[PDB]
Design a protein around this ligand. Sequence first.
Ligand SMILES: *CC(=O)c1ccc2ccccc2c1
Ligand SMILES: *CC(=O)c1ccc2ccccc2c1
Ligand SMILES: *CC(=O)c1ccc2ccccc2c1
Ligand SMILES: *CC(=O)c1ccc2ccccc2c1
Ligand SMILES: *CC(=O)c1ccc2ccccc2c1
Ligand SMILES: *CC(=O)c1ccc2ccccc2c1
Ligand SMILES: *CC(=O)c1ccc2ccccc2c1
Ligand SMILES: *CC(=O)c1ccc2ccccc2c1
Lengths: 215, 215, 215, 215, 215, 215, 215, 215, 215
Amino acid sequence: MVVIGEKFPEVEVKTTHGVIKLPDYFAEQGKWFVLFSHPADCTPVSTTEFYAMQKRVDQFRELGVEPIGLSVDQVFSHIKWMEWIKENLGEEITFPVIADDRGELADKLGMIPSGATITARAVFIVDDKGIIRAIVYYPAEVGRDWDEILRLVKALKVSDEKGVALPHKWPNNELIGDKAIVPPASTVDEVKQREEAKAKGEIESYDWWFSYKKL
Amino acid sequence: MVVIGEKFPEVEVKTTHGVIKLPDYFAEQGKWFVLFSHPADCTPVSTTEFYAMQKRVDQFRELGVEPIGLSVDQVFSHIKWMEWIKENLGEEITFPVIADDRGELADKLGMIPSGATITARAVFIVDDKGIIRAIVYYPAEVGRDWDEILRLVKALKVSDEKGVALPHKWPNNELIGDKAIVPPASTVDEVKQREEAKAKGEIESYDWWFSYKKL
Amino acid sequence: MVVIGEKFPEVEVKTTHGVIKLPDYFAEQGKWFVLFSHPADFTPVSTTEFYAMQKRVDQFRELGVEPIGLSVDQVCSHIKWMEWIKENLGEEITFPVIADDRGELADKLGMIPSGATITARAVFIVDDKGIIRAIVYYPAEVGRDWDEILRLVKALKVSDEKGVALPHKWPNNELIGDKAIVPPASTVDEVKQREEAKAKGEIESYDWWFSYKKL
Amino acid sequence: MVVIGEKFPEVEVKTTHGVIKLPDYFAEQGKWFVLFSHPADFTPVSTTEFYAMQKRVDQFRELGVEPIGLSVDQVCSHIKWMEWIKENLGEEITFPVIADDRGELADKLGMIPSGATITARAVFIVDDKGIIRAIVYYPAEVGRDWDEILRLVKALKVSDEKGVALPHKWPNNELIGDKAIVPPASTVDEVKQREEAKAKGEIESYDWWFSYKKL
Amino acid sequence: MVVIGEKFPEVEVKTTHGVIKLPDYFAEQGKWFVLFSHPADFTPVSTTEFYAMQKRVDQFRELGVEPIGLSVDQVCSHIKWMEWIKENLGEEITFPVIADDRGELADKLGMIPSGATITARAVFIVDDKGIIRAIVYYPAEVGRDWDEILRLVKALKVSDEKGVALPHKWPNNELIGDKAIVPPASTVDEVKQREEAKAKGEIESYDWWFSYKKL
Amino acid sequence: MVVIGEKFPEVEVKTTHGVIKLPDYFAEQGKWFVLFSHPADCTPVSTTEFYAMQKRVDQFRELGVEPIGLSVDQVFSHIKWMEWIKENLGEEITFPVIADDRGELADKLGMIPSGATITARAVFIVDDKGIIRAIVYYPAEVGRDWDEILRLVKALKVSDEKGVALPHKWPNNELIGDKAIVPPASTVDEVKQREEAKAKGEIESYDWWFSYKKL
Amino acid sequence: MVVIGEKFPEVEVKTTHGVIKLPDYFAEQGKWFVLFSHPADCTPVSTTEFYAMQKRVDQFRELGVEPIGLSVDQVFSHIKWMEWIKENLGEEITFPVIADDRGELADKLGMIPSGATITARAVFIVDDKGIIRAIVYYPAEVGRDWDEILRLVKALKVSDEKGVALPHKWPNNELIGDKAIVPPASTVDEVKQREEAKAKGEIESYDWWFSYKKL
Amino acid sequence: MVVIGEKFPEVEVKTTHGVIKLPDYFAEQGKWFVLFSHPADFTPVSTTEFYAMQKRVDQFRELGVEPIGLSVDQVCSHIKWMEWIKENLGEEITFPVIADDRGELADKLGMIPSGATITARAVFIVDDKGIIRAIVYYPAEVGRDWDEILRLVKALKVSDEKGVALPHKWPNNELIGDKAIVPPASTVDEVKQREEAKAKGEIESYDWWFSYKKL
Amino acid sequence: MVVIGEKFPEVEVKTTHGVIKLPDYFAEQGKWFVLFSHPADFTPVSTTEFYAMQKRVDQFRELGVEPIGLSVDQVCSHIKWMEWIKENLGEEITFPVIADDRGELADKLGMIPSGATITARAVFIVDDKGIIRAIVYYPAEVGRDWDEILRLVKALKVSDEKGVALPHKWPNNELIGDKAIVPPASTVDEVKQREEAKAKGEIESYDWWFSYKKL
Ligand SMILES: *CC(=O)c1ccc2ccccc2c1
Ligand SMILES: *CC(=O)c1ccc2ccccc2c1
Ligand SMILES: *CC(=O)c1ccc2ccccc2c1
Ligand SMILES: *CC(=O)c1ccc2ccccc2c1
Ligand SMILES: *CC(=O)c1ccc2ccccc2c1
Ligand SMILES: *CC(=O)c1ccc2ccccc2c1
Ligand SMILES: *CC(=O)c1ccc2ccccc2c1
Ligand SMILES: *CC(=O)c1ccc2ccccc2c1
């Protein structure tokens, strides 16, 4: 019961890093946060996701995006589980993990499938304004791909710094490559695009179909 | 607005290939469908993405999954855009594209962003039984990856046809590789199965809940 | 839904020249507007229409009448259509083009043919009081004639300011010529003037009702 | 939300010994169950309680009463917690533990304290007929005493077998010792019956209502 | 009907010590109170319980908690029953006994069994803030044990002033003995804090969550 | 809640002489019952009415009317209070006393003095048909007069064996005296039913005003 | 349906002394009223009742209570009937007699028996505060006793004036005599000072609850 | 409330001859009834009218009409009134007397004068069809004349049994005598027939409309 | 729709004596009026009645009451009818006759029979106050008797001047004769000659309530 572009509910949650409020603990220091949920149905796949997210927690943090886990568990079970991951899989877990009980956040963030209080492997990208910028709902049985979520958060970043729209499989589109397209003029072209085209920058056009930055 | 597991609503949707009873046009014939969705026809990102997904439509077709597009527009715009893609890109669109003007289904499926009348870049994987099986909600500025929607529907089909859960980034997991994950022992008697199955060597395991097999 | 002499509905809508409300945005600067709706962008007959009435827009502008296009598309590809016309036809486009979606305004002006969702070729003359003065509905397959809408607007301005009525084919009429028609004598006392003003050479007449003056 | 004597709510619970029907599963084999809710897994007080219940689970079972745990946790981390107990405290847990996520059963039993979402330390004695016979609600911070729940169960059993009432701190009451208390005479034939029984010395008494017999 | 941690309902009731507003009488005058409810006056089990409660009312009061009885009876015959106890059992009841007719409070406290009018054998520990700390509903047939209620009140105090949690059967726990339990490390930084304080000799542990200090 | 002539509510309720059903227990043997309910508050007055009712229960019984007390007490307190009567006022109470629960029978009869949750001093005379013959509601503070209730019952009997009406203060009226009043004739036929063989044998005529059965 | 203690329903009723509001005429005059009622005018038993009521109207009024009859008849019939009374019985009825057509007031007070449209023989003693202090409901077939109502009123004024409670058959109780009952002690301190007062001899008692004083 | 020709209300009325259905207890045996209403029994004028109605009750009965009295009184006091008349005046009243309680039928027939509560002196001649044939309303102060009601009833019977009209003071008319007036000729051919019959001796007449035949 | 005692409705009526407001046209002169309605002019029975009213209009007027006719006719037909009466029956008609337009006064006076639009033979006695004292409703077929209406008006006037009630058929009563009936009022001052004259023969009596004097 949330959509893209809606404010994250600014709620109080107990994590393995204190008790925080979400678009305060991250939005205040101008941080995005990738809030990824977990069912308690499948928790060997959750383990692989936690091993992978820590395996690539630098890439998220270099981007200025804070990973933050979530599940309907208690904190003590999570710290014990993450210590198991450190012991068996040789990997710390450095990001916080929310512990919502009775699934209040998942009810107010729409992560509860109907007929089962948890079946969704949900990911929310929330920007430094607190805007829910992208949602993913994998099934419990299929572990996600954090390379894809890395690509999505890189694309959300680039579209924010450079105001562009990011093609399919950017930056490995088969037609284009890594070139991000400037959103087409919703008014007369001259307002920005003719001023800023290859006459006055690297906002070069692509056969008059669009303007790309390659940036 | 909708969640996984929840039934796909019954709705009559007009498409470039006719008018269909959407949850049943594929279910009755035993097909899955990736109801994906773009903001507006002829947008360059949506064009790169229709191109890419029709270039992967074969791989969606070996898996019994039928692509279908959606947009809050008219079939006229869909067909005009499809024949632009036809002539100008060296490939033609071979999947129905819904005209959901009036936003009857996008509202229903939570597909429009907050404060908008246009649709986001959504994907709904719906299975042969008409059950919403997966969702993603990319924003308009970021285009999907269909390789990672192959991997999600490849993994969904494998989990349905073999009763296994699939790890992070399967079949490219860094702990396991392509080996699935068998359901964890959720019973003390079933736990005793996993220490003997590991000892028997039938499956590999880490801790009687994280058990994986080459299958 | 509308008829002649009815107030043009108060509507807020986006255009290639920005977002305006157009019962009275053109009436604020005391100008008339010829709202013409065409079926689809990048269709050749609509392109000939737009090119021709850009070719003759200085004649509409001189008359204090502001052309404004319309179709159920985006300002996206309205701008791109204008750019294509500029390139391949050597002609700018200098008038707003409403991107009324959902067929909202087109449903209030009743210019969606029954059994369709694409606009016909409608034209509405609206005067600087916000009142509809003429409607035409050409079918989608027949391009209009802007020379005739221009003749309409010249004649209808002349009637508006000089209190006259204009004949068929004015100012090229076979009987009268370019002379207008004075309001018919709808009273016995007025018949006295006409039967007498005809004998002073201010107006010519066929009878006391068919009285016309050179102006 | 439940009271003594009320029938235990008919529910499905996923224990660590499979999925069972509560009022029934223990009813068929002529068994009571002491259902005790603890707040969370890997909790210190809960771990002392689980260790102490295992140390005297046989005393509960030779009474015909089967301890069953409960928590807002998951069957994974119940076994993992019970495995921790096995090698750290040397006492392997042999009774089921309900993994009542979303607290729903807890919500029906009023085991969730005010404002919280985790459970308190509740105990429900339920007999063969699925009737709640006793309830305690300790706070999360105070560990229960299973010797008092044993004493309560022993007394609850004797009052059914032998139709008596049991004195305070039976079988170590100050006034009586281990003699039970016959139900008080509630009519004038029963008071004369009691005084005649006290005359024949079958029972002792302090008065006609407070009459007790060794049993 | 009420649960742990709830505010004791604000109500005035008449006792053998006068009419008192009870969540406020000994709340304002700075004391906890143990509200215990017996089914009827001149009941033998209730008589043994009142005898025992007066035997350990000194121990209750020296802890700052005041016993208060309750029954669906009159203040008349409450005093008559206490008088009977005084001559027959040779010790005088010093604590107030609420006489709530028609079971107003006894339904506000969910303290009458199902299919009954008489009250069960309930106990409510309430702190000086008016907060229900613990609840124990015993069946009419089983007399309570006030040594367990003393243990629970001692532990509730020690948990309030010393900010700890108390193990099962404290201060005679099997694993620990009389030593309290420090609240578990709910954060990974607190996990290091417990790990380091363990190598400071002031708490010892079997793990980072199960830590128990000396007092 | 009940009026004259209305059925006594068929209720089962527990007495000092065992659980009985009211309109039926006494109508079995076709004898009436006088149900007198006292408040549980003003014990001293009720003590004097129980003493008086016992002093004249022989006169009530030989009339075929069974006294039956009622109160919102417990049978233990009741039949310890009646023993107090026997011990301090020297007469055994020998009539049943309903110890009703919640005052349910008080609600069935509307004997509640307003504002309070207790009873007034009600008296219901119910005949061998379960019909309420008379109703008295004294206040809690004023004892009744059973002698008056004696002559009300004697009159209610004699009015049934003879079909008469009984004058004021019968049989000690100062005008009419002992003699009853045969109901005045309400049909011409009844007029000759009153003028039969010496006017029904031995009913006399006062002057001509009424006929009476003197004895 | 009105019980002891309820405010008398404020009604406007016609009487043989004009139209009068009931909880005003006597309340706003310092007087209580004994509102009695007979079934029908001119009936011999009701005539004896009216004769006796007029014979002791002086005793009633010197006591502060003034009688007011009532019937479901007309004021005209009361006037005629009282003329018969004055001529034949030689007593001029002085008190007002209500006449309520449709029996609305009699319906508010439950004065009409079931299976009847006429009134029974009711008596409502109401104090100057407007509160119903006593009710009796005799049937039509039994004439009332105004000596009993007079004793009740004498006894019920003394309760208001002297703040006591009056025993059975006061002032001719077979235990006490004419001495009233002081409020029972409802506190252990009150109990103590009750034995002190008995020792000092101001009151005399059978127990600490049954204390009486000679006035 | 009723007019001539209106069907007499169907009502059950308690007479002194038992309950009867009033319009048709006499319509069944083909008797008319003269319903006459007096203010009250034991009224001096009403007694003279009842005496006189008895003194000519045979003339009414031998003529097919049944007298029936009415008052707002009880059926007794009619019986007692006839007994006073039978002994003091020597006439035993043979006709029934209605006693409508609470003025039901009096309201229906409009015989309660304005500002009063008892009936006036009404007379309703009702024929064996249940049709009100005549109405008189004398005031309470003026006794009626039953000879006028006799000649009115004789005239009504003649006019029904001869189809004729009866003159003023028939059969003692000044102009005509005992001869009855034939219905006036309401048609020109009926006029001619009357003139023919006048010139036949079949009728006499002062005009075609004022024709009378001896009968 | 009117009853005895009401004020005669204030109306404007056109009579053969002019247009009057009749409730007060006669009231102002201090005169009663007997308003009588016949069905139609040139009706035979109506003609005998009009002849008879004129025969005794003197003894109506020497008594203070003015006859006034009424019918739903036109005044012109009224005078033509009086003229017919004068020439044929040889007598004037000196009282007014109302013509009401389609019966307004007749319909509000209930003079119109059921299922008809003409009047019946109604009579209304109206005193100088404008109060309806007596009503008769004869049918159209039965002529009235003005000697009885005289006796009624004599009796009404005697009752108003002498304050008595007139017996049946006064002054030709069978029992009393021509003597009136003195009121049963008490009037302590007045009732002394009611006793002495009772033995002086001035006031005779059949009983204490049935008393009559020569007047
Ligand atoms: C959670 C998990 O490991 C697992 C494995 C296999 C499954 C098959 C079908 C449905 C759910 C499954 C979950
Ligand atoms: C499977 C699961 O949920 C879980 C919870 C806690 C754990 C602690 C240590 C090792 C493994 C765990 C697994
Ligand atoms: C969908 C749209 O706006 C569009 C843009 C360009 C086109 C070119 C050729 C044919 C159809 C087109 C449609
Ligand atoms: C609507 C839009 O964004 C767009 C972009 C590029 C186009 C190229 C050719 C034709 C139409 C276009 C529309
Ligand atoms: C009020 C009540 O229930 C009561 C009153 C007097 C008593 C005397 C002795 C024993 C019990 C009593 C109870
Ligand atoms: C019950 C009793 O003894 C008592 C005493 C005095 C009272 C005064 C006013 C109202 C009720 C009372 C009851
Ligand atoms: C029942 C009634 O109205 C009645 C009864 C006896 C009577 C005696 C004398 C006079 C009137 C009576 C009326
Ligand atoms: C009501 C009734 O029966 C009644 C009323 C007045 C009377 C006066 C005199 C004689 C009898 C009467 C009866």
